[model samples]
Target: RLDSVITHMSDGIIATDRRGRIRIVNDMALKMLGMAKEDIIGYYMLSVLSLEDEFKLEEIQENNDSFLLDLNEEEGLIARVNFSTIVQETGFVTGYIAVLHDVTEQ
Candidate 1:
């Protein structure tokens, strides 16, 4: 149910698995992140975006089940990139969702 809305929204959406493997990439997210769908969709997230994080995969992933992160832009120009996660009904912890919102106008 939630998947439907997230996948079809006008915003960019990136979903990672428990191991932080890229599982879904929405159109807007692809453009915002400046990458092709084929590039990161099935790959491990940290390897691509570099996650802009210093913590190791295991340490940072500790909060995988749910997180609302305000990340700094890749180039240090754009402020506060918002990131979150989704938990599936199957009890298997899903991955985080990174949304590139346009704070340019804000």
Candidate 2:
């Protein structure tokens, strides 16, 4: 249900597994990263997303229900990354969801 409503929009979308492996990436995300499906999915987010402060990303995933990011150090504007944790009924770590919102221009 969520996937249907979120993945098709113009906004970039990226989803990660519990261990931080890039799983699903929307077309918008492909454009945002300037890469292709082969270049992104299955790759470690740290490598592709240029993740520096991993602890920070982890915190965003754990602490709050969701966190929004813009103006990342490595990427300029249009570099928004929103993070959320997908959990199970027993409170187990299922996976993580990341939505990319790149506003390159104003």
Candidate 3:
């Protein structure tokens, strides 16, 4: 059920480990970023998104706000990214999940 939802969702989904390495990426995410599964898996999330100068991994994990990402300057592809933390029963943060909504036309 979850797999179907993830695969079919219009928004892009990106899952990363606590250290900010890409763990999982959905099809929508690949399409949005113009990247293949092999190209992003295990790569640093910030580098993949080209957001190293904008934010640190820890800052992103700690913040609860959504932000706009200009993916392609020439193509004018923009995405609104929201972050959610994956917390364990013991209140430990194991990873982070990012949902990307295409807002290029907005």
Highest TM-score model number: 3
Candidate 2, pairs of clashing residues: 78-102, 78-103
Clashing pairs in 3: none
> Can you write out model 1's per-residue Cα lDDT over 1-106, one digit (the tens) per residue?
2432222245556678877788987776666566778887788766656654643355542443323333335744242334555667875556766655545533
**Model 2, position 84: C-alpha lDDT score:** 69
What are the lDDT scores of the predictions, listed in order? 0.57, 0.63, 0.77
User: What overall lDDT, based on C-alpha atoms, would model 3 receive against the true structure?
Assistant: 0.77
lDDT of 3 by residue, 1-106 (tens): 0111122268888898898889999988888888789989999888888878887878755576778987754566788887676777777777777788898433
* TM of each candidate vs. truth: 0.59, 0.67, 0.81
Tens-place lDDT per residue, model 2, 29-93, is 77777787997888876567665555444675445443344433355445556666676777666
The model with the greater TM-score, 1 or 2, is 2
Q: Order the candidates by TM-score, highest first.
A: 3, 2, 1
Residue 42, candidate 1: C-alpha displacement in angstroms:
1.4
After superposing candidate 1 on the true structure, give the runs of residues whose Cα lies further than 4 Å from its correct spot: 1-10, 56-79, 90-92
